[PDB]
Enzyme design. Sequence first.
Site, mmCIF file in Angstrom:
data_model
loop_
_atom_site.group_PDB
_atom_site.id
_atom_site.type_symbol
_atom_site.label_atom_id
_atom_site.label_comp_id
_atom_site.label_asym_id
_atom_site.label_seq_id
_atom_site.Cartn_x
_atom_site.Cartn_y
_atom_site.Cartn_z
ATOM 1 N N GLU A 198 -10.403 2.756 -5.517
ATOM 2 C CA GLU A 198 -10.269 4.163 -5.192
ATOM 3 C C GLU A 198 -9.301 5.023 -5.997
ATOM 4 O O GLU A 198 -8.560 5.786 -5.431
ATOM 5 C CB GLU A 198 -10.007 4.352 -3.683
ATOM 6 N N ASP A 243 0.842 -1.168 0.000
ATOM 7 C CA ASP A 243 0.000 0.000 0.000
ATOM 8 C C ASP A 243 0.882 1.223 0.000
ATOM 9 O O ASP A 243 2.042 1.122 -0.133
ATOM 10 C CB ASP A 243 -1.012 0.035 1.141
ATOM 11 N N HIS A 261 -3.052 3.502 -4.147
ATOM 12 C CA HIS A 261 -2.433 2.813 -3.028
ATOM 13 C C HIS A 261 -0.958 2.438 -3.168
ATOM 14 O O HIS A 261 -0.570 1.368 -2.896
ATOM 15 C CB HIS A 261 -3.277 1.636 -2.634
HETATM 16 C C1 LIG Z 1 -13.593 13.003 9.847
HETATM 17 C C2 LIG Z 1 -15.057 12.830 9.439
HETATM 18 O O1 LIG Z 1 -15.785 12.041 10.043
HETATM 19 N N1 LIG Z 1 -15.440 13.591 8.392
HETATM 20 C C3 LIG Z 1 -16.806 13.612 7.817
HETATM 21 C C4 LIG Z 1 -17.084 12.282 7.006
HETATM 22 O O2 LIG Z 1 -18.195 11.583 7.600
HETATM 23 C C5 LIG Z 1 -17.348 12.485 5.491
HETATM 24 O O3 LIG Z 1 -16.933 11.349 4.640
HETATM 25 C C6 LIG Z 1 -16.008 10.345 5.105
HETATM 26 O O4 LIG Z 1 -14.702 10.690 4.626
HETATM 27 C C7 LIG Z 1 -13.654 9.749 4.982
HETATM 28 C C8 LIG Z 1 -12.383 10.229 4.287
HETATM 29 O O5 LIG Z 1 -11.604 10.962 5.222
HETATM 30 C C9 LIG Z 1 -13.961 8.317 4.515
HETATM 31 O O6 LIG Z 1 -13.080 7.400 5.201
HETATM 32 C C10 LIG Z 1 -12.382 6.484 4.323
HETATM 33 O O7 LIG Z 1 -13.293 5.490 3.849
HETATM 34 C C11 LIG Z 1 -12.692 4.592 2.902
HETATM 35 C C12 LIG Z 1 -13.820 3.691 2.413
HETATM 36 O O8 LIG Z 1 -14.668 4.444 1.558
HETATM 37 C C13 LIG Z 1 -11.583 3.766 3.574
HETATM 38 O O9 LIG Z 1 -10.852 3.015 2.597
HETATM 39 C C14 LIG Z 1 -11.260 1.639 2.348
HETATM 40 O O10 LIG Z 1 -11.493 0.868 3.576
HETATM 41 C C15 LIG Z 1 -10.332 0.287 4.250
HETATM 42 C C16 LIG Z 1 -10.423 0.610 5.739
HETATM 43 O O11 LIG Z 1 -11.581 -0.037 6.282
HETATM 44 C C17 LIG Z 1 -9.009 0.792 3.655
HETATM 45 O O12 LIG Z 1 -7.896 0.164 4.304
HETATM 46 C C18 LIG Z 1 -8.958 0.454 2.163
HETATM 47 O O13 LIG Z 1 -7.757 1.009 1.593
HETATM 48 C C19 LIG Z 1 -10.213 0.975 1.382
HETATM 49 N N2 LIG Z 1 -10.798 -0.021 0.419
HETATM 50 C C20 LIG Z 1 -11.576 -1.097 1.056
HETATM 51 C C21 LIG Z 1 -11.694 0.635 -0.541
HETATM 52 C C22 LIG Z 1 -9.746 -0.668 -0.385
HETATM 53 C C23 LIG Z 1 -10.565 4.710 4.252
HETATM 54 O O14 LIG Z 1 -9.659 3.933 5.065
HETATM 55 C C24 LIG Z 1 -11.236 5.811 5.096
HETATM 56 N N3 LIG Z 1 -10.237 6.836 5.446
HETATM 57 C C25 LIG Z 1 -10.075 7.346 6.684
HETATM 58 C C26 LIG Z 1 -11.000 6.805 7.761
HETATM 59 O O15 LIG Z 1 -9.241 8.212 6.966
HETATM 60 C C27 LIG Z 1 -15.419 7.916 4.815
HETATM 61 O O16 LIG Z 1 -15.750 6.754 4.039
HETATM 62 C C28 LIG Z 1 -16.420 9.027 4.479
HETATM 63 N N4 LIG Z 1 -17.756 8.650 4.972
HETATM 64 C C29 LIG Z 1 -18.860 8.778 4.218
HETATM 65 C C30 LIG Z 1 -20.163 8.339 4.902
HETATM 66 O O17 LIG Z 1 -18.865 9.206 3.064
HETATM 67 C C31 LIG Z 1 -16.690 13.781 5.035
HETATM 68 C C32 LIG Z 1 -16.727 13.910 3.513
HETATM 69 O O18 LIG Z 1 -15.472 13.449 3.013
HETATM 70 O O19 LIG Z 1 -17.402 14.847 5.662
HETATM 71 C C33 LIG Z 1 -16.975 14.971 7.045
HETATM 72 O O20 LIG Z 1 -17.904 15.818 7.745
#
Ligand SMILES: CC(=O)N[C@@H]1[C@@H](O)[C@H](O[C@@H]2O[C@H](CO)[C@@H](O[C@@H]3O[C@H](CO)[C@@H](O[C@@H]4O[C@H](CO)[C@@H](O)[C@H](O)[C@H]4[N+](C)(C)C)[C@H](O)[C@H]3NC(C)=O)[C@H](O)[C@H]2NC(C)=O)[C@@H](CO)O[C@H]1O
Lengths: 572, 572
Positions: free
Chosen positions: B346, B227, B281
């Site tokens: 992604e 990654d 990634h």
């Molecule tokens: C901080 C906060 O809460 N901000 C809010 C958010 O509710 C809102 O949107 C959220 O934005 C986040 C980005 O910072 C998103 O988090 C990321 O979600 C992706 C999945 O869509 C994660 O990647 C996948 O999952 C695993 C981990 O479980 C990862 O290892 C993989 O690489 C990947 N894949 C499976 C696809 C391969 C990612 O890790 C994660 N990143 C983080 C947590 O830092 C979150 O999905 C998103 N939520 C929603 C409901 O859309 C934001 C708008 O961006 O608004 C803010 O108010």
Amino acid sequence: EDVVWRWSCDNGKCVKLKNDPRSSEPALSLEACKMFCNEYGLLWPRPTGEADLGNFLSKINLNSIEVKILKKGATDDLMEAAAKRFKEQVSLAIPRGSTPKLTGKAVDVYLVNENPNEKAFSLEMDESYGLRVSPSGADRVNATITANSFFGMRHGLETLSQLFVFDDIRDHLLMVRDVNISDKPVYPYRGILLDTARNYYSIESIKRTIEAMAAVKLNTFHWHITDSQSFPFVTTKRPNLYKFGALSPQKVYTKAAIREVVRFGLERGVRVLPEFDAPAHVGEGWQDTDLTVCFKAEPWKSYCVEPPCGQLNPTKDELYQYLEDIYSDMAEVFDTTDIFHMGGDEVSEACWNSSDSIQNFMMQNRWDLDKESFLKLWNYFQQKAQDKAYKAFGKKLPLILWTSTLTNYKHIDDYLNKDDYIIQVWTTGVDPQIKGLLEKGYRLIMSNYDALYFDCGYGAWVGAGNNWCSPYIGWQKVYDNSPAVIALEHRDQVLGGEAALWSEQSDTSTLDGRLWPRAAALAERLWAEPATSWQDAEYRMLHIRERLVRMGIQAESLQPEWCYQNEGYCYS
Amino acid sequence: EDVVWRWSCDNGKCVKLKNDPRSSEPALSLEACKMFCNEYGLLWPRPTGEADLGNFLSKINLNSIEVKILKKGATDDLMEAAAKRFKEQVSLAIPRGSTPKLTGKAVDVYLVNENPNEKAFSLEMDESYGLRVSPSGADRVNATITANSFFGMRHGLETLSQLFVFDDIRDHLLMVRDVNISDKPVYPYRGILLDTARNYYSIESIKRTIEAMAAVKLNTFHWHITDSQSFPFVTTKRPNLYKFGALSPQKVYTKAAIREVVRFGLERGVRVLPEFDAPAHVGEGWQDTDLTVCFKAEPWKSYCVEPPCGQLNPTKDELYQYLEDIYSDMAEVFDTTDIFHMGGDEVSEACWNSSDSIQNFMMQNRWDLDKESFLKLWNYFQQKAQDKAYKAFGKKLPLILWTSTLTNYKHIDDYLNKDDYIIQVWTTGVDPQIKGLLEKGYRLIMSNYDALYFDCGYGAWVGAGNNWCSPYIGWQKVYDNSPAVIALEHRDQVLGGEAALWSEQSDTSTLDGRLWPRAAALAERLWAEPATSWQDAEYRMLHIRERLVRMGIQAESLQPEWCYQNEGYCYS
Ligand SMILES: CC(=O)N[C@@H]1[C@@H](O)[C@H](O[C@@H]2O[C@H](CO)[C@@H](O[C@@H]3O[C@H](CO)[C@@H](O[C@@H]4O[C@H](CO)[C@@H](O)[C@H](O)[C@H]4[N+](C)(C)C)[C@H](O)[C@H]3NC(C)=O)[C@H](O)[C@H]2NC(C)=O)[C@@H](CO)O[C@H]1O
Ligand SMILES: CC(=O)N[C@@H]1[C@@H](O)[C@H](O[C@@H]2O[C@H](CO)[C@@H](O[C@@H]3O[C@H](CO)[C@@H](O[C@@H]4O[C@H](CO)[C@@H](O)[C@H](O)[C@H]4[N+](C)(C)C)[C@H](O)[C@H]3NC(C)=O)[C@H](O)[C@H]2NC(C)=O)[C@@H](CO)O[C@H]1O
């Protein structure tokens, strides 16, 4: 092979840079950079007094560290044990499978315990210390720890071990050159509650927990050794309780085991405080005594808040004989504690009203059968129990009860007094019961469920969904939970805090993850009471997690290691 | 001392009863009761075919178990290794610190592998088996396992080990007397995804995971070995990637280590399937190549969904040379896999548009700079990458990509074909993309995030609060998540399922808890596809957790042990 990278401090963040050969500037390893880049370096908790770490590091020979005890006394054995452990603590600086070059300066550590006969735990004990590190002559170092008692002194040894760093670029063991530190904890009671009745915990696991507690200066282990589910405690006087009570013959805590835990604890500055929860939370082990009611009563939702139900029958005179024996047996092996926890949580009215013998008892005393009636019975029980407790420990000592219906501040003085009873708060930190209690003079231990229940967030254990107090409480939340904010002007009445690990969903296997590193946040919040918030402590928290892993603790993982190596890139 | 209790079956629940001396009825130990009280006894997963366990148990001498291989072949070494392990598996019946009396019957285990030369993994492999246990003569037992291949045979050995129980009342090792079982998995792909790039996992920890997988018949280990955070894979051809990439020189996977894991896996019926995630990634390890864009781009929210950002630059011709080398190096050590995972998750449009070299490339191809433009670039990349992958493995083999913008069912056929590409679903199980994909003929692997993301529920790793996919997913939820329900008539296109452990908040320390016992729920759901729900499987799930703990796995604790001992009292 060899590390390829180096680190450089820029605006409080250590930035990873290629270690290019065409340079005249000496490369810094990651920890060496963090040590001076960070306001408090690698320390956890950060000190409350002087925290001068200087600007340099010296190379040290691991095989040349010698500890000298300046003042002898009753605590000699303890001071000696502590000194012995110090080398092992220093080796924690070094990653497993890595060997330092045996070169550099020799370190002389001088321990000065000003009251060397003192070794009793008390709310009033002096856990303060002074630490000074400076070069001595040409090939050596003077590390001096000066404290009012052994407990302070041991804390200082803990801080001093944190002042060592391993340079994995050069394979050198290093030490901060000039140190001036003075420190003391803000709060006297810094604990973890361990529930060993809902599931058994191996004694090895208990000791491991104590080592981790010591690492971050937590001082109190609250052993909730009984509940409705099991009776692991080996009571010589009333042996059937354990015999019937235990999950198995193996899953028991013998007198010899408890003594082992209590001593291991005393050596490490940790009070082992036992709890006998009553009059609710009893079941297993009491069969054939006729001293309980509602054991396994069905449906359980009618009579209690978790299966299995069961309460003591306070109307039975023989009950006090059993309690007296149990308390005495506890007192004998838990001989370092200055306090006794008596439970007092969640007494069920329905469960008491379903008993004939009990209703018959109340009718004869002129009490009705309404809820205010039941409080009369509870007090009657608590007063007698209390008498036995004093008798067992041979003195009047402070007793702890949970917040409950009995302890409601409005009528609490009808039942207890603020001198005799400490109240453990598991309500939200914003609940009215807290201020009201404080206004009435009551001392408190904070265990608010919204911040300090370590069990919360997993799957349901009855039904489906998630457990009762979900979501999972992150370290950020534990760190920011402040007793000083919660109590305001009455702060001095807050004895401190305790992280709770109830064990409906925890045992020997999960214990390291449940407690660490989250309990470290509690540890800093209680020791230092920082004005600052979690983000200010974040890099240090990442380091301390790494340290627990080095110790052999299976600590929860907080962030990617990439984040630890690249400060500031990971934020939100 | 000695166990004091006995158990008796009443309406499918084993009830704890005092083991009173004035009885003519032989007392049953807890496991012995569970074995016949339960519809499937102590088995996990429950079989799909015949599941006749009879009504009795026989005492067995542990030192008298002998395994005989009836048909020799190319799989001889594997069959032999498996046989050797069998004794150890039987000892798992016995709690640590307990010793069985060495008396009873001798057990002859006959292994009949009908195609003893077969040892390749494929989606079409026969994992079926027949198991029969019956008394032989006067002092012995005939246990016969008959299977079409070694994989089926090993599964049978696993089931047979589950047929042993330890009587801790008598200290006797027991075995189910008359058994007739026939079994085969519903789905061919039963996996766990392990992310070893977000945090490092010791190779010992990886092997331990494989052992637990084998215990419950999971067959696929998906190693997400790279990654943006790190490049642990030791690529001989392009060594700087690991050298620059690794968290440390120690935190690497050498060719010798991978081979060790791959063999340990093959011996245990587990495919080790590697992933090289592209074109997103990527980060660490690529420095100085000029083959990436946006590595560590700030602010990260503008360019990716987790720090650090970084994508491959598909316009660079040299890139395909690097990929070809990486794929080749993977192919060499991952030599049991029949499938390759290419990531495809992604891809960021902004990140590609911020590059001049990239915009320049597109202008020359007549493509615009809108989002549909970028899909052209992604396909161009994927097509070339794919060519290299075929070259590395020396054949065309099925490739896996995640659900993404590229894989949207509406335009998927423009880019891929259903013959060449398997799609891994991480959407909710109710998302429209699933049916649409299925209608177009696509094969799927279910990893729906609402049920199968093992990482969810903990604290935030950026900011505060909780992680993105919270709450924590309980075993009840994983068990009830059904691919058959999700896919309906198109079920045959569902290859199976995979539990995902992304490692932003997981490593070597937490790996046992994250996976077990939850992965066991997936294991049953995939093997058996029960019509029944989680409550029907609950007691058996409690037992299997205990078994994993006996194995040395630090399994999560699900309920109080009191609950396990007292079936039916704990419900909601
Ligand atoms: C901080 C906060 O809460 N901000 C809010 C958010 O509710 C809102 O949107 C959220 O934005 C986040 C980005 O910072 C998103 O988090 C990321 O979600 C992706 C999945 O869509 C994660 O990647 C996948 O999952 C695993 C981990 O479980 C990862 O290892 C993989 O690489 C990947 N894949 C499976 C696809 C391969 C990612 O890790 C994660 N990143 C983080 C947590 O830092 C979150 O999905 C998103 N939520 C929603 C409901 O859309 C934001 C708008 O961006 O608004 C803010 O108010
Ligand atoms: C199944 C369901 O969700 N039913 C809903 C409920 O939302 C709703 O009320 C809930 O009822 C539960 C009783 O079954 C309550 O759970 C119990 O909560 C108590 C704390 O109040 C827990 O005991 C304390 O906490 C620890 C564990 O963290 C425990 O070990 C200690 O003994 C105890 N003390 C700290 C006080 C010493 C108890 O374990 C837990 N029991 C369970 C989970 O089985 C829950 O609190 C309650 N929630 C609310 C918001 O009131 C129900 C009405 O009863 O209605 C249903 O629709």
